[PDB]
Ligand binder design. Structure first.
Ligand SMILES: Nc1nc2c(c(=O)[nH]1)N[C@H]1C(S)=C(S)[C@@H](COP(=O)(O)OP(=O)(O)OC[C@H]3O[C@@H](n4cnc5c(=O)[nH]c(N)nc54)[C@H](O)[C@@H]3O)O[C@H]1N2
Ligand SMILES: Nc1nc2c(c(=O)[nH]1)N[C@H]1C(S)=C(S)[C@@H](COP(=O)(O)OP(=O)(O)OC[C@H]3O[C@@H](n4cnc5c(=O)[nH]c(N)nc54)[C@H](O)[C@@H]3O)O[C@H]1N2
Ligand code: SF4
Ligand code: SF4
Ligand code: SF4
Ligand code: SF4
Ligand code: FES
Ligand code: FES
Ligand SMILES: [Mo+6]
Ligand SMILES: [S]
Lengths: 148, 69, 949
């Protein structure tokens, strides 16, 4: 059934100019990562080589090589968010979940994003497609509460 | 049980037939420029013996073939 | 001579207006786009570079070619900085020194100090640029590395273990600087994107998307290797053996492209072979076979001493030269007196030089007293030499391989250049990726069609045999419409004939709408392709064995030349009608006689004016009658009146059709000498044997497809003591001729004296110029890169009425499927040279590319054993289901003898040159277990015959 979805995706991006990125985006959105089982057909459709595809996949960060937990937590580690106390937040959260930075699981996945546009609302995060700001050491409780 | 020689002759004929102008002269020229003594002799023997499975063009072209010593 | 040859400049050569500049206070004049680095190279002032190579376009990765330029800010790169007039550049200041030292510091901070026990010592472009810049200290107490197996706290995750999956080179990333020349080469030069850069930053590692190189799309060709400076990618023969000292230029014994090499040598031991950056044929590129497969010359199975049998059932007997030749000549004279001189014959080898070729045809004419010689070209590209002769005036190519660079379209009939002629396909893809267009007329999806970054492509997947119908329909389209060039016709060709041709072709029976039934190709597609070909400014045709090896080959070639003349794609760089010659020195061979109807120079044998010249030159009476051809030989010997044969460098059994017949004809022969290296399938029916020499031991020339005469040099020493021309003269003098040659230069001199074209040929010329196109007389002294450039040879082209004759090998109930025989990249024709190498990896067993739907009803599965129940024989083979081929078509390969493939193949042949019908054979593929009745007996014979005493 995966092949069907993939074919659909490829058909949807037919004739476009430089359609590798969109196609990969969609492939990821579908499954959750770029399986090596799907490096070839993409190439076959686009006239590329498995290698080029894998290289593109490897370069960019937003293309998962392996799936994530049921929940995901991106936590800015940039300048501004750092300024208004991101370290402490990070510590509290990774103590709560027991998962350090970059370390994933079947349950959750904590990672970094390096900005979100919430540079005034300095301590910022993205939890499961929901943005959060002004993350003091209290809101983390609510963050974890809705998130086991 | 066709002779390889007859086959080749008929092939050459089949070709040179569609050509414009002299259709036998060229046949003879080719068979004389390309084939060897025993083969030419065999062919001439065939045409003289009036063997079947042979194109009339070759029959016409045989007398024009380079003679055998 | 040029500097490009010996020195690795930085960037490629550019064309443009002259531009003056001052590199480090030295005046230079060079084209516009040309870089600073290349100019500085041309001026002698060397600049530090690691990531810049001529093979490819430059990229600012190393940052070590930094220079101070007046009018610029900072320290820009020379690799990327194109010259401009009045530019003044400084190459070595204190600043630049400091920066370069810093960069190398950074490099080496992540490099192991395994110099002095690394393979590429003395040949690493990192080491010598680390000593150049003046590195003396590294200050970074590194913790994060790639080479270190053991980090702190445990193993290094970054460490990637070696990869020796490939049998010819090895990948040790521990020593990788990420210059990316490897990638750039596999993608720009070769054209198969097998390599990429996995990762972002320090984590960036070269990699093929696979566990190992072998599993990948990487075939071989060591471009990746030829370009890696840092022993990461390295040849194993350099790991085992040491790094070489000297270099010697030679050519490949394959493929007819003439890929020139320089053999690297450490004493007398051949360490490796690397392209030269010379020859218009290869500009520093190769394939696997030439680059790596040269180990047949050192195989245990090679034979080094003459042997005589006196009866095929009886075993061999290792014997010296003298008594062997005595026996030989005795039997020969006996037979010559008994059955006549016409009862003898030879078979020249294209694999051999042209000198030896000349000697052999002499031996056959001057000595034996006949015209019964021949060669491999009866079966590869004979019809060509008839059609192009009847139309233009030459039985040879039209252009070089540098022409393709200028074409705007490629029409490929019957060829698979990725396997046949790789290095040409590379240059083709280079042009395809640069906009050019492609038409392919094969029935079998070739990998040229699935090239990366391909432009537009049309594919006429037809039914084999119907190759003239399609051309006729193309012409019908062009004439029905009005797209052809009238100026060209009026000028370089005739008009009286053009009218007739047009009136013939204009018939609606030869229209695409009707042939679609028998052909299988669609109509609209054909019309489109025709319009596209006829519309383009500079189009070029490259054809091979799909046209020739048929019951209508000459006809087809003629049709093709007609198209080429109609459209006007002749007599110019970028256009022509190029046949892709195969074996090395097929062209040379055919040029130096090796045909039973001609003398050296494609001069007929009945020409008294020529026979006189040669009688005078050789001092002997010659024959005016033309000799026999191989099929004729065999039929004769079956019937009688043929008793002798001197087989030079050719396997008449595995590499010829109707194997049963040829065997029965080779057995009924009181004497059949052999002059190969190894014990071939032919020697199973032999009475005598003479060792030959490899291209490494030889000395002479090779005349390739683009008529280029590449020079072959001696690097090793003949293990059997004597090369092949030496042996030939041995035999001849032993018979009673009385030749005295001490060096083949004398022979080449003789040739230049006798035949025209080679009159200006001299070894010194080849050494200096580098190479020559054989039409080199006092006129066109440099050579003739392009034929028919000013009017045709006969004077006026000729239009000929072609028609489609239904082949006799049509299909029926018991032979429903068709058949096709072809090739592979790794293995050569019979693999006597190649099965004795490590190329049995990519291909160790011949397989049958069958179609699925044509298999389901049969019950075939990938890896299953099947039988080819044809008319002319039967064979067992392993299957392979693939949509490559069309339904009702099957594809086999004849590289392996364990499978007897040409036994299936039928006796049917061309009308003119009698080239066989290899590419068409009605067969029946079915499932089976018991191998066969023929293969068993064959193996029995071969085993009971290859035993020595
Ligand atoms: N690595 C390697 N290199 C080689 C060789 C090798 O064996 N291995 N062989 C050497 C020699 S001696 C040779 S002859 C040369 C040239 O060898 P090529 O010219 O490459 O000939 P092939 O690869 O046999 O097939 C040519 C293509 O045409 C297809 N074809 C079959 N029937 C038809 C038909 O009716 N019409 C058309 N339009 N096409 C058809 C064949 O199936 C195939 O796809 O290469 C030389 N180079
Ligand atoms: N079914 C089928 N049959 C075919 C073809 C096909 O496509 N399909 N192709 C046809 C064509 S394209 C051709 S070229 C033929 C080629 O087929 P072959 O005539 O078999 O040519 P090669 O494979 O080079 O081997 C010839 C012999 O010469 C030996 N030799 C190599 N180098 C030297 C040297 O330097 N000196 C000496 N004295 N000997 C040497 C080699 O070891 C080898 O044993 O096959 C033809 N038959
Ligand atoms: S690749 Fe070059 S610099 Fe690196 S260890 Fe080997 S010889 Fe030394
Ligand atoms: S050997 Fe040739 S095909 Fe293989 S990776 Fe290197 S450049 Fe590419
Ligand atoms: S493998 Fe060799 S050529 Fe490729 S990036 Fe590494 S050092 Fe450079
Ligand atoms: S492309 Fe042909 S000539 Fe060049 S190395 Fe390969 S086999 Fe030899
Ligand atoms: S810096 Fe984290 S929000 Fe932009
Ligand atoms: S030196 Fe020009 S960029 Fe590497
Ligand atoms: Mo060939
Ligand atoms: S050939």
């Amino acid at each position: 059934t995966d092949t069907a979805r993939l074919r659909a995706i490829l058909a949807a991006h037919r004739g476009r100019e430089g359609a590798l990125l969109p196609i990969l985006h969609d492939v990821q959105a579908a499954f959750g990562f770029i399986p090596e089982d799907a490096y070839a057909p993409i190439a076959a459709d686009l006239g590329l080589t498995r290698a080029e595809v894998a290289g593109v996949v490897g370069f960019y960060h937003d293309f998962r090589k392996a799936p994530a937990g049921r929940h995901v937590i991106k936590l800015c580690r940039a300048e501004a968010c750092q300024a208004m106390g991101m370290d402490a937040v990070q510590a509290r959260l990774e103590s709560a979940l027991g998962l350090r930075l970059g370390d994933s699981s079947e349950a959750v996945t904590l990672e970094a994003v390096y900005c979100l546009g919430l540079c005034a609302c300095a301590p910022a995060a993205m939890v499961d497609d929901r943005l959060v700001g002004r993350l003091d050491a209290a809101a983390v409780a609510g963050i974890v509460a809705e998130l086991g | 049980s066709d002779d390889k020689i007859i086959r080749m002759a008929n092939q050459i004929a089949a070709f040179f037939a569609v050509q414009p102008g002299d259709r036998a002269g060229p046949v003879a020229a080719h068979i004389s420029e390309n084939w060897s003594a025993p083969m030419r002799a065999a062919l001439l023997a065939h045409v003289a013996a009036q063997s079947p499975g042979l194109d009339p063009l070759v029959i016409a072209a045989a007398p024009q073939i380079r003679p055998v010593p | 001579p040029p500097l490009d040859w010996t020195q690795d400049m930085g960037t490629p050569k550019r064309e443009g207006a002259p531009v003056h500049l001052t590199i480090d206070g030295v005046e230079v004049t060079v084209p516009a786009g040309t870089s600073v680095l290349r100019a500085a190279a041309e001026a002698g002032i060397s600049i530090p570079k690691l990531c810049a190579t001529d093979n490819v376009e430059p990229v600012g990765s190393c940052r070590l070619c930094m220079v101070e330029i007046e009018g610029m800010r900072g320290t820009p790169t020379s690799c990327t900085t194109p010259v401009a007039p009045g530019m003044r550049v400084h190459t070595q200041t204190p600043q630049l020194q400091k920066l370069r030292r810093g960069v190398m510091e950074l490099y080496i901070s992540d490099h192991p100090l395994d110099c002095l026990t690394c393979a590429a010592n003395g040949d690493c472009e990192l080491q010598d640029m680390a000593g150049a810049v003046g590195l003396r200290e590294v200050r970074y107490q590194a913790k994060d590395t790639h080479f270190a197996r053991r980090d702190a706290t445990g193993p290094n995750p970054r460490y990637i273990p070696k990869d020796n999956s490939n049998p010819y080179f090895s990948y040790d990333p521990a020593k990788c600087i990420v210059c990316m020349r490897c990638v750039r080469a596999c993608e720009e030069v070769q054209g198969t994107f097998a390599l990429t850069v996995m990762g972002r930053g320090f984590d960036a590692r070269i990699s093929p998307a696979a566990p190992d190189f072998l599993s990948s799309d990487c075939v071989s060709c060591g471009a990746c290797v030829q370009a890696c400076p840092t022993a990461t990618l390295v040849e194993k023969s350099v790991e085992r053996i040491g790094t070489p000292e000297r270099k010697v230029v030679t050519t490949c014994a394959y493929c007819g492209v003439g890929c020139s090499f320089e053999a690297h040598m450490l004493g007398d031991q051949l360490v490796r072979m690397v392209p030269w950056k010379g020859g218009a044929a290869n500009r520093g590129h190769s394939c696997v076979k030439g680059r790596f497969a040269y180990g047949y010359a050192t195989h245990q199975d090679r034979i080094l001493k003459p042997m005589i049998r006196d009866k095929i059932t009886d075993p061999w007997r290792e014997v010296n030269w003298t008594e062997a030749l005595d026996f030989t000549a005795t039997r020969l004279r006996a037979l010559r007196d008994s059955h006549g001189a016409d009862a003898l014959g030879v078979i020249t080898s294209s694999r051999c030089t042209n000198e030896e070729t000349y000697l052999v045809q002499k031996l056959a004419r001057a000595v034996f007293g006949t015209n019964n010689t021949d060669t491999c070209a009866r079966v590869c590209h004979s019809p060509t030499g008839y059609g192009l002769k009847q139309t233009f005036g030459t039985s040879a190519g039209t252009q070089d391989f540098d022409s393709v660079e200028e074409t705007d379209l490629a029409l490929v009939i019957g060829a698979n250049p990725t396997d046949g002629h790789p290095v040409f396909a590379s240059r083709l893809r280079k042009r395809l990726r640069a906009g050019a267009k492609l038409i392919v007329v094969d029935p079998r999806r070739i990998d040229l069609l699935n090239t990366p970054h391909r432009g537009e492509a049309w594919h006429l997947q037809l039914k084999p045999g119907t190759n003239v119908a399609v051309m006729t329909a193309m012409a019908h389209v062009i004439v029905t419409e009005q797209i052809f060039d009238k100026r060209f016709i009026g000028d370089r060709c005739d008009w009286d004939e053009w009218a007739d041709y047009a009136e013939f072709v204009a018939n609606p029976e030869y229209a695409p709408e009707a042939v679609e039934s028998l052909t299988g190709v669609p109509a609209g597609l054909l019309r489109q392709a025709a319009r596209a070909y006829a519309a383009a400014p500079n189009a070029a045709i490259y054809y091979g064995l799909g046209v020739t090896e048929h019951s209508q080959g000459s006809t087809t070639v003629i049709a093709i030349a007609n198209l080429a003349m109609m459209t006007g794609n002749i007599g110019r760089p970028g256009v022509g009608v190029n046949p892709l010659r195969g074996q090395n020195n097929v062209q040379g061979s055919c040029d130096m006689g090796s045909f039973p109807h001609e003398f050296p120079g494609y001069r007929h044998v009945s020409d008294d004016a020529t026979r006189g010249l040669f009688e005078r030159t050789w001092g002997v009476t010659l024959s005016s009658e033309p000799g026999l051809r191989i099929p004729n030989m065999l039929d004769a010997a079956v019937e009688g009146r043929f008793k002798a044969l001197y087989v030079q460098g050719e396997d008449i059994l595995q590499s010829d059709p109707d194997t049963r017949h040829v065997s029965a004809g080779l057995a009924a022969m009181d004497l059949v000498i052999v002059h190969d290296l190894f014990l071939n399938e032919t020697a199973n029916y032999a009475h005598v044997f003479l060792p030959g020499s490899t291209f490494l031991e030889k000395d002479g020339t090779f005349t390739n497809a683009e008529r280029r005469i590449n020079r072959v040099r001696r690097v090793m020493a003949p293990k059997a003591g004597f090369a092949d021309w030496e042996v030939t003269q041995m035999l001849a003098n032993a018979l009673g001729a009385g030749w005295h040659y001490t060096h083949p230069s004398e022979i080449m001199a003789e040739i230049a004296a006798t035949t025209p074209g080679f009159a200006a040929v001299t070894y010194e010329m080849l050494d200096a110029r580098g190479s020559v196109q054989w039409p080199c007389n006092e006129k066109a002294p440099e050579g003739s890169p392009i034929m028919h450039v000013e009017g045709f040879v006969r004077g006026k082209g000729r239009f000929i009425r072609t028609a489609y004759l239904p082949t006799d090998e049509k299909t029926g109930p018991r032979f429903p499927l068709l058949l096709t025989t072809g090739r592979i990249l790794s293995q050569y024709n019979v693999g006597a040279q190649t099965r004795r190498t490590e190329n049995t990896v990519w291909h160790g067993e011949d397989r049958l590319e069958i179609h699925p739907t044509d298999a389901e009803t049969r019950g075939i599965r990938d890896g299953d054993w099947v039988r080819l129940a044809s008319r002319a024989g039967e064979t067992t083979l392993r299957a392979t289901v693939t949509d490559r081929v069309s339904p009702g078509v099957v594809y086999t390969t004849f590289h392996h003898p364990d499978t007897q493939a040409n036994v299936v193949t039928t006796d049917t042949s061309d009308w003119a040159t009698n080239c066989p019908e290899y590419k068409v054979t009605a067969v029946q593929v079915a499932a089976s277990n018991g191998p066969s009745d023929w293969q068993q007996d064959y193996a029995a014979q071969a085993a009971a015959a290859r035993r020595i005493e």
